[PDB]
Amino acid sequence: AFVVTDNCIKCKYTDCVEVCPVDCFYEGPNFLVIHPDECIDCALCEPECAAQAIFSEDEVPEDMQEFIQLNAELAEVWPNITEKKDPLPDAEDWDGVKGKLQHLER
């Protein structure tokens, strides 16, 4: 599985979904997650994300390990998303700010 990590929050560009062959992105108000059992590890979404928030599970930074199970949990409850949409307003402002987990919306 690939995993969406902190810099997605409050950015949510959603360019990542358009290349996902198996449609395994799930949408929250201000964050996206990858369903780890649906994900086929094709890696195509990783270069598409301007926030550089996507990692293969084995390369998730030590200080973002929580996002691995968070992705698996939220993918069970959020609705699938399979089409590009406009980035969040002020996405640019939040791209690169750390610890945005504190702002995650359910």
- Judged by CB under 6 A, which of 8, 11, 33, 34 binds ligand SF4? 34
Query: From the CB of 83, what's the least distance to ligand SF4, in Å?
Result: 14
The residues with which 34 forms a beta bridge, in sequence order, are: 25
Is residue 41 part of the contact set for ligand SF4 (CB under 6 A)? Answer: yes
Would you say 15 or 38 has its CB closer to ligand F3S? 15
Q: Is 67 exposed, middle or buried (0-12, 13-18, 19+ CB in 10 A)?
A: buried
- Judged by CB under 6 A, which of 49, 60, 70, 74 binds ligand F3S? 49
Strands 54-56 and 2-4: antiparallel
Chain centroid to CA 98: how far?
Answer: 15
Could you list the residues known to form a binding site for [3Fe-4S] cluster, using ranges.
8, 16, 49
